[PDB]
Design a protein around this ligand. Structure first.
Ligand code: HEM
Ligand code: HEM
Ligand SMILES: [Mg+2]
Lengths: 90, 91
């Protein structure tokens, strides 16, 4: 009856996919979930390039843009949890 | 013979971009990046002239005002050739 200790909060992709609009947008980048709602209208690349990646892996999109170190550091403020292990590639 | 610094990406100066302003060779600047669209002119659904009209200048607002689809934005990546030189960016 020993129990695994919990640490990070996991979200399944099907739950992430429900926050898919200007009301509330979560994005998945490198295995982590970011609630970027508050940043949508500040994002230099605009809202639409973020919105269109709802519910899918946004990592390739994010990396192809060539985001600066400053942009990468801004990521952490929007962190809310990790994608559930069952939704990752092995 | 001395130390030199290197950049991550390939840069093109706006002066080099502005020379490719025709059907023979057309480059565009969209969101700080340079695209060689010569081979796409003929197939572009919005026609050739709206692309040719943006030679030599920043085409970002024109591209954004059209409301291009996600497919069109992914397609834009196929034409990427480099980033605009840092010295050509507005403050
Ligand atoms: C999710 C957290 C994100 C943050 C904090 C973020 C942050 C930033 C920042 C600060 C810039 C300014 C340039 C730089 O510093 O590199 C930028 C530019 C940009 N971002 Fe993001 N970004 C995020 C996600 C994304 C995603 C997912 C996409 C693509 C689907 C995207 C596409 C772009 C584009 C296209 C630009 C260039 C804008 C231009 O100059 O017109 N970003 N981003
Ligand atoms: C290499 C960069 C470009 C690509 C890949 C591209 C791609 C496309 C595609 C695929 C479409 C069909 C509709 C859609 O899927 O959104 C389209 C339509 C259109 N494009 Fe572009 N385009 C580019 C640059 C531009 C630029 C710079 C302009 C403006 C000067 C422009 C103006 C238009 C117009 C007017 C339409 C048709 C009207 C529409 O349905 O909104 N495009 N473009
Ligand atoms: Mg001309």
């Amino acid at each position: 009856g020993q129990e695994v200790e919990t640490s990070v909060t996991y979200y399944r992709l099907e739950e992430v996919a429900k926050r898919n609009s200007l009301k509330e947008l979560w994005l998945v980048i490198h295995g982590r979930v970011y609630d970027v709602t508050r940043f949508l209208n500040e994002h230099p690349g605009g809202e639409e390039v973020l919105l269109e990646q709802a519910g899918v892996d946004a990592s390739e999109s994010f990396e192809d843009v060539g985001h600066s170190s400053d942009a990468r550091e801004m990521l952490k403020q929007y962190y809310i949890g990790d994608i559930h292990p069952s939704d990752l590639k092995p």
